[PDB]
């Protein structure tokens, strides 16, 4: 039985014998729905996933350079020039430098100096587009206790899904995938097997060398200068040196961005949020007021308190009169046995006709002292329980 | 002849027939010293250099991790533990994580979780000490025109040096190596063949994994955590991932630090500054009032204006009466030939007794119009010259 250990757990109560109830489904969270004359159910947003993502743009964050060449001109002798100046495998820089008799020119003044160097990208990061046609939310439904579990796929192009639950009938989901998370201002950035969701403008403003799309043969790198610094201009040459890898720098610049992961070709996100409408007219308790279980239960574990104050118990049943209705309640007075608190796991049922079957119950005790009571008459079990509120 | 093309050029005039003159020697700069009845001289701080530098501390800036192991404990069941927790080849992290029936524990609460992973450093940067015993300033002296050139080595442990200049006698240097640059608050940092001088505290504050000195076998890396982030703690495990290379980050953090270079094992600096006392009693014009050159000169180049307003000329001489005293002056009136302006290259001399020898002169013209005059009588050369001040 799920949701019990989950920290981010909501409790939603139904309305009368009403059709619908609204829920907010968050990632790594769980919603427990309870309605009168309904089996208690568990809704969980398990995985948001994005397939078929299109490479929008790549940025080089580590490069190397070699084989530099320079051209210099004397004052009044024009612009310096190299063939490789417009060669896409090279990065260049024009500047001015002091010239005189000391270095070959017949007059003392600024001369033109160009320096080019072979450019090769070692590593790059890639920003991909996210279109709602390939977005897909995975939701798991589990009856509260016991094909009593279903998994459904809510997409922005199909926000309505129905899920059958065996002898409990079926539940219906109408979710708003629009109000989930905004992916028209977001890119899927990957860099050395680390993955984030980033904002489009921020991504476009990234001052690294770039190309669009990853075409074949040779990617044409724009703005190679960004990874290469030119220094110490002499009369006839100029020193070129790469900056470091800007990987850690980017990672630091992504300290507070949504983190995602990869799985095969499909991205998997964990920034879950999903408004949903739960339709519960076709949902039913196993529709048989069964005979109460006659034989005696026993605790397989001492009853434990969940983070939310509720109490989980697990019992083993010694009868073969299954399927039978489990007698379970809480009482302060052991004479009148007045039912206090309630059951999260509503109307529990032993469904197995073989002895020594196990059942989990989640009860919602009142404050102060109380007794967990399970069974009928003489062999019924009791267990002392205190609920200190906090 | 040096200094002419140099942008950072100082002009220091002597005093009477005085013993000393004070100069400030900067890197890539030059000082031209002129004293009456002295040959004009050129002082240049060429290279500051540091040998035998001792590794103070290394910082890892790129690493990799693999083979992670985790240990987790149920609530009230103690502290998690792994053997590798204290193993120096591993990086670990302790944390707490939600536990309950859902993941093996019999009670709902925080459990202890430790995760360790093999740690390997890919690349590192090294900070070395700089002791004034291995600091060494290289100074070049060149007579203004013409073993007329010397190179001397000023060290903090020998700030006094003497340099002979052939038939010009000798010059003496007493420098203050203390007031040069402060290297007791500086480290020599190298990182991927890039080199800076950095401040000690800043270097110590660098939050990267570190070790002292580079001993053999296996360096013990302190603070490995700095290159490794732990994420998304589950009940029984926890994801570990390296940050990027912090190379570019460091480079960015060094935008405004003194940049240096390497040469063999010896560091070479370019942040030159050196106060010096020039002793000039033993310095002499070639001590012979020679006969004036009788034959005729010719311009090998049109006279050019230096960045400092002065004018360089080069002449070829057609006589064999060398060694002889070059007749050179400037005049506004070509009748009285009144000497105007002066000569930087003071008392120029043809020293070669073979015809067609070359000589460079640097003259200091007055403002407005003037005539560069070189030679005697009929075959003397004139050249019109304007000095517009700026």
């Amino acid at each position, epitope marked *: 039985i799920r949701c019990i250990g989950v920290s981010n757990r909501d409790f939603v109560e139904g309305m009368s014998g009403g059709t619908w109830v609204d829920v907010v489904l968050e990632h790594g969270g769980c919603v427990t729905v309870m309605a009168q004359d309904k089996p208690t159910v568990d809704i969980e947003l398990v995985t948001t996933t994005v397939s078929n993502m299109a490479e929008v743009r790549s940025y080089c964050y580590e490069a190397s350079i*070699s084989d530099m060449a320079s051209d210099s001109r004397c004052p009044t002798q024009g612009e310096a020039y190299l063939d490789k100046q417009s060669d896409t*495998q090279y990065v260049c820089k024009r500047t001015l430098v002091d010239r005189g008799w000391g270095n070959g020119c017949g007059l003392f003044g600024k001369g033109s100096l160009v320096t080019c160097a072979k450019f090769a990208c070692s590593k790059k990061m890639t920003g991909k587009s996210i279109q709602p046609e390939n977005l897909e939310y995975r939701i798991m439904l589990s009856v509260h206790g016991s094909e009593n579990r279903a998994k459904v796929e809510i997409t922005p192009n199909s926000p309505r899904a129905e899920a059958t639950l065996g002898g409990f009938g079926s539940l219906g989901l109408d979710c708003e995938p629009r109000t989930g998370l905004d992916f028209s201002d977001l890119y899927y950035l990957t860099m050395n097997n680390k993955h984030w969701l980033v904002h489009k403008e921020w991504f476009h403003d990234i001052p690294l060398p770039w190309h669009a799309g990853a075409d074949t043969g*040779t990617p044409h790198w724009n703005n190679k200068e960004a990874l290469v610094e030119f220094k110490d201009a002499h009369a006839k040459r100029q020193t070129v040196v790469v900056l470091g890898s800007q990987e850690g720098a980017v990672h630091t610049a992504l300290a507070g961005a949504l983190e995602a992961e990869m799985d095969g070709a499909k991205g998997r996100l964990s920034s879950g949020h999903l408004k949903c409408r739960l339709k519960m007219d076709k949902l039913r308790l196993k529709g048989v007021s069964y005979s109460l279980c006659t034989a005696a239960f026993t605790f397989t574990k001492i009853p434990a308190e969940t983070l939310h104050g509720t109490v989980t118990v697990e019992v083993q049943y010694a009868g073969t009169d299954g399927p039978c209705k489990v007698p379970a309640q809480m009482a302060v007075d052991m004479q009148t046995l007045t039912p206090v608190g309630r059951l999260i796991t509503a109307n529990p049922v032993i469904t197995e006709s073989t002895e020594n079957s196990k059942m989990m119950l989640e009860l919602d005790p009142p404050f102060g002292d109380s007794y967990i009571v399970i069974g009928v008459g003489e062999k019924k079990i009791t267990h002392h329980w205190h609920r200190s509120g906090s | 002849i040096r200094c002419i093309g140099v942008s950072n050029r100082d002009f220091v005039e002597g005093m009477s027939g005085g013993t000393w003159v004070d100069v400030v020697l900067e890197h890539g700069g030059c000082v031209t010293v002129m004293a009456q009845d002295k040959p004009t001289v050129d002082i240049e701080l060429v290279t500051t250099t540091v040998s035998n530098m001792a590794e103070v501390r290394s910082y890892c800036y790129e690493a990799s991790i693999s083979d992670m192991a985790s240990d987790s404990r149920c609530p009230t069941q103690g502290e998690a533990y792994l053997d590798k927790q204290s193993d120096t080849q591993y990086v670990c992290k302790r944390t707490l994580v939600d536990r309950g029936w859902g993941n093996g524990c019999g009670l709902f609460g925080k459990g202890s979780l430790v995760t360790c992973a093999k740690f390997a450093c890919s690349k590192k940067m090294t900070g070395k000490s700089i002791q004034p015993e291995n600091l060494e300033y290289r100074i070049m002296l060149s007579v203004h025109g013409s073993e007329n050139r010397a190179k001397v080595e000023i060290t903090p442990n020998s700030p006094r040096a003497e340099a002979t200049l052939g038939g010009f006698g000798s010059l003496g240097l007493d420098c203050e190596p203390r007031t040069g640059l402060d290297f007791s608050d500086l480290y020599y940092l190298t990182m991927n063949n890039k080199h800076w001088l950095v401040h000690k505290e800043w270097f110590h504050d660098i939050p990267l994994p570190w070790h002292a000195g580079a001993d053999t076998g296996t360096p013990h890396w302190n603070n490995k955590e700095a290159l490794v982030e732990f994420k998304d703690a589950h009940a029984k495990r926890q994801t570990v991932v390296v940050l990027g290379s912090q190379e570019g980050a460091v480079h960015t953090a060094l935008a405004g630090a003194l940049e240096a*270079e390497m040469d063999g094992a010896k560091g070479r600096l370019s942040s030159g500054h050196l106060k010096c006392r020039l002793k000039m009693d033993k310095l002499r014009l070639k001590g012979v009032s020679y006969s004036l050159c009788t034959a005729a000169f010719t311009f090998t180049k049109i006279p050019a204006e230096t960045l400092h307003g002065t004018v360089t000329v080069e002449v070829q001489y057609a006589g064999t009466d060398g060694p002889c005293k070059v007749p050179a002056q400037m005049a506004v009136d070509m009748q009285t030939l009144t000497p105007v302006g002066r000569l930087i290259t003071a008392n120029p001399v043809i020293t070669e007794s073979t015809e067609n020898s070359k000589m460079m002169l640097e003259l200091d013209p007055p403002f407005g119009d003037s005539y560069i005059v070189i030679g005697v009588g009929e075959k003397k050369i004139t050249h019109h010259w304007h000095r517009s001040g700026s």
Partner: antibody
Amino acid sequence: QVQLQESGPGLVKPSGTLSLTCAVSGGSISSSNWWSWVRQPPGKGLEWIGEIYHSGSTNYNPSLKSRVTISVDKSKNQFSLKLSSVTAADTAVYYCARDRDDLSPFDYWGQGTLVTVSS
Amino acid sequence: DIVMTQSPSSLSASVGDRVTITCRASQGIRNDLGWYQQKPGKAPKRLIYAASSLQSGVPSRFSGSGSGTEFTLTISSLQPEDFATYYCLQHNSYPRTFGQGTKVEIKR
């Protein structure tokens, strides 16, 4: 990974033209790699002749740039060297070679073919 | 054009000896220098790459150090298979240029 094999006539008339071809197998010649010609006169040292990228872009040794042309044939996965107006100074063992992708120096070499210049 | 001068030109050493070959560049090359081993009849093979970087398939007894204008290939423990002639190559400046080469013989 990749294998390089040179082929061409081992004899060239003085003032004639040396032609050599390097056939690359195991990998495409259109990878992010520069391809070089290097040579070595017998009993002497190595001299870098020239260089080409699959884009057709070339770099030649200045000492002999006026006489070399280097080209590519992606169709047959090879590249070629023309060296004109040869003298006995062009008598050497010729190697084709590859650079690695971090622009790093020769990471692969051919077997080497001797070419003599003689009448 | 940057000139690369190797020293010595030739060298005779016993097995197990430490051999130091020096390379000097007329201009600064940073660390863009490589070391190659040429066995007779065969093409040269890369031993080292960015002045320091030991390459795959090459025993760790080969090592490179230096920067700027001064570099050193050290072979720590000489072996019979190390009889060869070794070259240094600068590729910091177009055109790339080799040193004259250093021949390593063996004493036995």
